[PDB]
Amino acid sequence: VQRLTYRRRLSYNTASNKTRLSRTPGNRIVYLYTKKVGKAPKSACGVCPGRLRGVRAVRPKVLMRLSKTKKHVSRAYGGSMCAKCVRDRIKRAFLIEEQKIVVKVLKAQAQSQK
Amino acid sequence: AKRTKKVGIVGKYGTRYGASLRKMVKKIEISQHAKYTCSFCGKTKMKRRAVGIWHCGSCMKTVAGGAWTYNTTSAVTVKSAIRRLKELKDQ
Amino acid sequence: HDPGRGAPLAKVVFRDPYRFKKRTELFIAAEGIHTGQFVYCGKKAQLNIGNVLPVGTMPEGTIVCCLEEKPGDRGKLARASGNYATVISHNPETKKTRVKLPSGSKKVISSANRAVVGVVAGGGRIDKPILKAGRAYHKYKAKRNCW
Amino acid sequence: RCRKNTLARRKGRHMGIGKRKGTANARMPEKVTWMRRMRILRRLLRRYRESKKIDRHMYHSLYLKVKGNVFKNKRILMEHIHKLKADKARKKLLADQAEARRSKTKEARKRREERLQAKK
Amino acid sequence: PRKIEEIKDFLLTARRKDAKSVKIKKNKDNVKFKVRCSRYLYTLVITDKEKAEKLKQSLPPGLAVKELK
RNA sequence: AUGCCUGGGCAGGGCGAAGCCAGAGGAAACUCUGGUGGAGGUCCGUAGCGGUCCUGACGUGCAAAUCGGUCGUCCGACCUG
RNA sequence: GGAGAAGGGUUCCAUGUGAACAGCAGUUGAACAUGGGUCAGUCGGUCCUGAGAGAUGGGCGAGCGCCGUUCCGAAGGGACGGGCGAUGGCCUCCGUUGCCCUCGGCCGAUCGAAAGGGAGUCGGGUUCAGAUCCCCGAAUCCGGAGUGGCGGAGAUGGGCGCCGCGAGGCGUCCAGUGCGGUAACGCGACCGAUCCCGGAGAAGCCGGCGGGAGCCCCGGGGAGAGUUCUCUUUUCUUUGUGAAGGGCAGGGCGCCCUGGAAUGGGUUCGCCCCGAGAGAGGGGCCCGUGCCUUGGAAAGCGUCGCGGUUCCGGCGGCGUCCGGUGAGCUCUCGCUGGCCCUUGAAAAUCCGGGGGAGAGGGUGUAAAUCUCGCGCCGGGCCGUACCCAUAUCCGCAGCAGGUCUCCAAGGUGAACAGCCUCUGGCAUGUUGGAACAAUGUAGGUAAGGGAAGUCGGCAAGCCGGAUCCGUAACUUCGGGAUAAGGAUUGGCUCUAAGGGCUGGGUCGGUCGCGGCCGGCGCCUAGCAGCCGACUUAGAACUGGUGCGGACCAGGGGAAUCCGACUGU
Ligand SMILES: [Zn+2]
Ligand SMILES: [Zn+2]
Prior knowledge:
This is part of a larger assembly, with chains A (114 residues), B (91 residues), C (147 residues), D (120 residues) and E (69 residues).
Chain A: E1 19-23, E2 29-33, H1 60-65, H2 68-71, H3 83-113
Antiparallel strand pairs in A: 1-2
Chain B: H1 19-33, E1 46-50, E2 53-56, E3 62-64, H2 73-90
Antiparallel strand pairs in B: 1-2, 2-3
Chain D: H1 2-11, H2 24-27, H3 30-50, H4 56-67, H5 74-119
Helix pairs in contact in D: 3-4
The structure holds zinc ion (2 copies).
One zinc ion binds next to loops of chain B.
Chain A binds two RNA strands through strand 1, strand 2, helix 1 and helix 2.
Keywords (chain D): Citrullination, Cytoplasm, Isopeptide bond, Phosphoprotein, Ribonucleoprotein, Ribosomal protein, Ubl conjugation
Region (Disordered) (chain D): 96-115
Family (chain D): Belongs to the eukaryotic ribosomal protein eL19 family.
């Protein structure tokens, strides 16, 4: 059985020193240092536990190399907020504006009566 | 009483800490670990996240309540008194 | 949850009416305060739980928390875990009020300073016995080397 | 030598009381045995339900009984399912016969009422 | 490296100014043409043998088409 | 010696608490039986940590405090850079 | 055994010597004398901040200095747009600086981690000694790109009036910062500022389950091989593919659409979910470290044979294959839970979103491309050898002491226990020979008694694993408890039980054994075939009553005093 050593000078098994096994054309198992697992952006609402879809879960400095379409989705608040909370915001804004209009009309009617 | 007679949750402590202390603890230990009914969704999802803070699994609503109970009798009394004073003041 | 503090804190977002910005504040959460709740602060604020208003406006017998011992110190009195101060009587002349503190002392305070309506969230914390050296060790490790 | 010893073990040998140093749970975990049995029984129940062998309510009742470990293996569960199916078939046959008799009686009474109304 | 599905695309890639030695490897029904560029080594796999023989004569400028053996 | 920050580590087994499932009894309150569950500043025990006894060995020693057997603990008031 | 961190600093390699050291010796050495050796955009420092340290302002102090890091500060010398002035370069066009107008929160200069965060290199070959660094082959990250080096997106639409049989051409009005899907969302791009919001960075411990990989196992094919006095289709070694892209398995979703469910249903090892939309269908997204493909068989390895006195990094034939498995060990990913009077880090940096301040050419072109595919240039400075420990570190030394980590084969076995073996390592640890006296140190054995020895059962000894029975006093009802006390344990030959995958749509008609349609059987008590990991119980036979046969491996009971306990 082929026992293998670290290929760098960081002997301590830390977060930055994580490795995986890989077989080479030389027919010997070696260590490959794997990158950290990136996470997709979370919704700006702060209420939905799930993370946003349609965007690659990669490191922020790799987001710079990623293209624009991979970093968002074609929608209002796309890639920053979930569709459920987006439509909730839309309907809430519409309803609050309608209620404000109704209150303004009632206040004008009260002023006219008085 | 299927397995334990009069310990239940405090059976993990074993013979240690004293019978009276374990009996006194039992109420708080059950209350803080019991899931309450969220009065926003109606589901039994209110779980004590930490000291004095409870979280709803479904509503994702976080409520600042008691340390071991969702609502304390002192909180209920002060809420009722504040409501009464508000009504008296506003008329 | 604030380490080393029994009472939980609440982050509240206001909008500063001078610049296009959203201010954030760390209030002491009164019992019953929940997320997605509107809190109103000021002389004209309504008398509801989770609303900081001057003690002069509120009527007698009002239970408050995070009381300001002096006008403008942002709240110092009755803010530990579940403690509360009681507004006993108001004196319109000289702009002074009487407050019963959780220790039982009756203090004369200014009517200008504000207070948050309701008791502090997290009462009954001391009822549960510690039951261990370890629980006390973990409690004091987050506060200071005094256990 | 190890291959021959393993073949002897497979035939059943060197596994007596005097060659067992660990407890029964250590040698074969009861939790894993329960996992295997539950998975087998639930797979059988789901296969029957999807093959239309049992109805939804009977499937749910058998699932609850399996969780309560009424059945110690797959054969006894299969036999219990067969007994339940035979009982259901007998009860359905009797109910259908009674319903047919009642429908015939009601139809005859309705025809008699129609005849009486026509006669006036 | 990048694999090319079209012989016309392979010819366009090989016709680049920065293009260089294009080697031919006869792999016993898996014959390939590998053209080296500045960034990628573009490979084209031809199943047919007569088609590869015909493509051998399609090099415009007299490149380094020397085969691999 | 202690406080803080940032990292690493701790085989295999016994006891089987909350919670849940099924069966039986009851008029109810609910109670018994068989399972699932793996909690514990829980027990045996390895690595690790420490040093009870033989007042063993040595005692101008391997060593200005070491070695052998037997030892306490080993999921938390744990050990450590 | 193979590699590191701190520490040492030439101890690393080759040659030569045996003056001195290696408590004997030495042709030997880490000794001595000569010469050689550390090759980086990708491995780390360098950057950021944590606990913390420490200037300016201010205060104190006889004074060296101290207090303090936002506190008794006129604390940003920065930026877009506009205006003025000037030089420079085909003063066309651009850049530069000077002034003016304008805009602007930050939060303390600075230091602080070779284990925290931190973009991006892998495979083969190679030296006496260095090689993710050198050679070859494949990549990738950042910065620059004025004139912009190319293609491609903003892109070449409609209307009206004419000519032309027709395709088509001319004149004029225009729109044109993209498109598709109900939806989740997708397509190679797809203008955009001051400003604002958000995300990643960025998170505890423990348990369970599932996916993937490395290793181990078994049934075979090959190649090389030990035994063959008898048997053994024999036992032993090998039997592969990188980073970076494309596609597909395989996982997860608290994502969407049709629909509305009690006769409650779905579902896990456990949980859990549902009229705030469950089952059932159709879709969508993330990781895809795994399989196929470019890389890539050219190279590597196992064999057979040659060229070459010698140098020679050579030349060639073949193989590098087909399957199943497991609470199996390790690593990683993903769900799910339990615990906290513990809630389990900051900053550098990057990205997304709300807005349209502003730009564009006007009908063939342009401003822009958070740049879509290519093409060009550069990446500076420091460490890179070795030891990393019964001889390269610290203990006065080649000292039985101490010193932070990674890799973890087979058998027995619960086991990372002890014992034996494979890869790898070594000469038994500052010396050898000859006898086996007394004292000793470390192991054992002893007829009969069994603590009568001794201050004291000091020491030794007894029991010890597993399976099946049984288990008292007391009690805080949790325990005591493996209480106490009993039986079995080997070998060989059998029996029973605990499972997966596939298969009937058979008859007729029709089309090319395969496909479609119709009524049939609808196994709805399931049968037939094929595979596979271990167990549990029982039965007989048998060995000189021996069987947890080595190893591992609890002595119990009745009480008193003290301390609750765990811990120190
Ligand atoms: Zn949301
Ligand atoms: Zn709720």
